[PDB]
Amino acid sequence: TKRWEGGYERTWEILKEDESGSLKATIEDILFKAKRKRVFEHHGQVRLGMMRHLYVVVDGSRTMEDQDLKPNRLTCTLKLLEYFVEEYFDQNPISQIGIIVTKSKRAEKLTELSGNPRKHITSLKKAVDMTCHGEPSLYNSLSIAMQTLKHMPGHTSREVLIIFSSLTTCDPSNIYDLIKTLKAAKIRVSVIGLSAEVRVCTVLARETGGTYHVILDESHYKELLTHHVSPPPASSSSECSLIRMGFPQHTIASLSDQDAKPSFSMAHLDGNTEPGLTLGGYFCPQCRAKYCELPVECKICGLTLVSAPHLARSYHHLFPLDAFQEIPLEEYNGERFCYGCQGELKDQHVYVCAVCQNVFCVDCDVFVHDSLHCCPGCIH
Amino acid sequence: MKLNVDGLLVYFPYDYIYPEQFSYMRELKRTLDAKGHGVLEMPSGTGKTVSLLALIMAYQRAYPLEVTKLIYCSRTVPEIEKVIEELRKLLNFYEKQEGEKLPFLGLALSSRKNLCIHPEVTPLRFGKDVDGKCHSLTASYVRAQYQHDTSLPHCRFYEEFDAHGREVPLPAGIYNLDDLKALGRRQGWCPYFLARYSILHANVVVYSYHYLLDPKIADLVSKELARKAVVVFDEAHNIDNVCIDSMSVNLTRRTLDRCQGNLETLQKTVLRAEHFLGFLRRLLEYVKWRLRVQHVVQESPPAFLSGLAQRVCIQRKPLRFCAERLRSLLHTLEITDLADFSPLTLLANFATLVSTYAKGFTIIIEPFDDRTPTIANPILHFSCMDASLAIKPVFERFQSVIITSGTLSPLDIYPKILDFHPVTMATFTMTLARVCLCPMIIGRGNDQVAISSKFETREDIAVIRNYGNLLLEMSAVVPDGIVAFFTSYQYMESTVASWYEQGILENIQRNKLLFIETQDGAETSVALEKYQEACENGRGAILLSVARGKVSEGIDFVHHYGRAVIMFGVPYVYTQSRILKARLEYLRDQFQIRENDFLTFDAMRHAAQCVGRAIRGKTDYGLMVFADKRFARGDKRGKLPRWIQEHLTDANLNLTVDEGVQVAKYFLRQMAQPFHR
DNA sequence: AGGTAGTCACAGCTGATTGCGCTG
DNA sequence: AGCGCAATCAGCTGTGACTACCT
Ligand code: SF4
């Protein structure tokens, strides 16, 4: 039988009257039921992650001049890559991005593997005006990525993302041997095609554990990149995976004190123009080297300079707040004022924390579970 | 699961049944209940065999008396092995779903070379000598002399099979050819002889077309096996061609030289009955008279015997006795081997054919050769003209002969090409979650000039440039494999020469590798191997071949192999050599078949047969193009199989190269997304 | 002084004519 | 220069509003 060939639904039978006017009570119940439309979690997916050393390979062949994506594939690809780099560094604190451009059967390492987003964005903007010629070489790009990532620590997840526009690749040697070597090296390879499905990309993605997708339009391209942003699930505990990193305090210099010492920034020292000789900035806790941008690994002593708030922003996932016990107002024989907003409790349901047994209204409960991520009573 | 047909339940290994399979089962059950022949057309090479075998087994279980013997004649040995393994899988499914065995036997039949255990004959590559060596090793005289136990090397598998293998039967257990060989070698028996003994006590059996189309072996292999039996010819789109070739023989200088060389040896052996000893001597000069005659053609199917009875003045009666003399005089002469002896047998076969079959045949002498026409080469061939003769002895001996293939679009021409009484007129078009093929016809090029491969325009530079441009900018959109079929080798080489002359073949090379299929078997095989290895990785490849070649049907382009199939012009058979025109005249004055209609039917049959090999499996998908404006006309589109007609929308019937490329890009982009089951 | 059937523009369909193409 | 597919004209009709004549 069919669902719609039976009896027609009467959704208006829910409302009923006993005292001629209880519709106000019904609409109050409906308004209360309208709230709490979430699961008390902003993400609700992967609550953790792992250090990812991701390499992004961009096709630089003549096929990038095609106008499937306005204005051409290269410009849309680089714009979406800038967006992807920004989002990936936003959602991954201690990750690194490398960019490889393959052209004329050779692969050029456009950018070193590091955690600076500004350098990658500047490199992409510079590469916007590149010359699209020749044919891509997946073998050379994968060889460069494997050579770079072979010496990386085992606990980090090694990933390669390939943007393959051209349907043909030139390999100076057998590629399936390289795929076997990558599989033995536990390097994940993901490919996002632009024209159509290529067998070698499917085999590579299946064997290395990655995913192979083909772009339908620019929105689908952005969706695939956004999916690639998310970190992979992390095993319980592998080994002593740790890392020596510093937390450079942003100590600026004021001439009101006698210790106002101007210093050139190491990052700005490599620029053609005059480096910024500002009063202060981020001083390395180990060698007192000065940097302006974070997170940037120290050039001198090799220490990783990260920002503590960036690491702390993900701490609420480790310790989620347990849902408060929903209690009807009549059954709660205690105070009738919310502990968070001091407002009078007039809702039919009152939420009580399991730890401190305090009183929270619906709005304060939603705010605590969604945004605050901490019980105000438990803090005291 | 158990599929509930209108009057029976049939077990099927696969739980899900496509609507095409269900309708096919309905039609086949209707035909079996109708006790008549039929013709079927399905688009899937795989999944048809399992359904056919399942319905056959269900019908045998329900009606053991109505159906007793099943024949599954196919084209080659890979089809035999795949249908045998599918039958084995079906039997395993039945055993695991029922729990008790059944007394059903299924065996595969092939030549002596396929089924032999002696290591002294396997390494050699002479298919015409293996049978002779097998006969020499074991025969009636060998059996007679084995009583005295003569000390001489001979085959001994039969000498054990006749005393031990003729009593123990094999009621249950279907055996493949390798299984038959293993049983023969473990029991010391010949696989061929045990197959000959066990075909009588068997349920199903599979072999090639030649064991039923050729009268010289059909009687030996099938004489009184079963009065009421079911036979099916899967992949029989070219049944007429093989039927014609069944009664076609050729003669050349080498054949007559071999005959005159071996007649002296025969006479020397004889001088160490008389009705043929002097009969065979003077037959050579009558046919060598045509060697010295410098004439274009002589045709006299009824008057050939009249002319024979004048130069040598021989009666017609002794000619028909050659067939019965072959099995008698040769075994008494104790021929050591059939090497240097086959032309003598083929001369007797030709004499018997011309003496008996003279109503629908024609004799043609062709003094022409490729690249060396007139040096010394009067070629005499007894070309058959009617396809009904090779199919008569099976329609009257069977009840439900079924003709099925992937290309049987016109069901009104096969019943009149060969004497047939169809009662089905049934076709089936596959359905999937998405359209797995994108057929389209490309007419004029970017210059709005037709790319028709017309004879007057074959040498035109504009059409060659348009073909090259189509192959170039098509090779940049379809990845990992393109198969292009040309009308003929001469046109193919002349087009690639022009492409090389211009700076256009380099642009095709830098996209995909170019591989050219030639007449050499080893070169073709190695080219196919390197094409496959280039398609495996991302390099891509192009397979340039001919529609009427051994590679068009010898291989199947499964998914990721040949995503696009390109037809450069309508493949029309050569009207020269005065062989096709004789058949055209015979069909014109006998079956009232229009010459243009038959030529278009043959062209479209070949085009569809070579373009439908890119879709093997539900998940497989492929691009199909037709690079000729003549395809756009309705009289040729209507000859395409129904599973391609509905996917060929009227939007793309004359679109140029650019719009064809755009359609291909959209199709390939939309076919790469994940789907469901 | 007021109102309805021709009439024009623009499109559709089906029913025939009638005019160009039709094999290596 | 005989067939056959395809382009083309005739006849009727739908949609919408404009307009001439007279009880
Ligand atoms: S009898 Fe059988 S085993 Fe012996 S030579 Fe002939 S085919 Fe081979």
Ligand SMILES: [Zn+2]
């Ligand atoms: Zn430092």
Ligand SMILES: [Zn+2]
């Ligand atoms: Zn509150």
Ligand SMILES: [Zn+2]
């Ligand atoms: Zn609390």
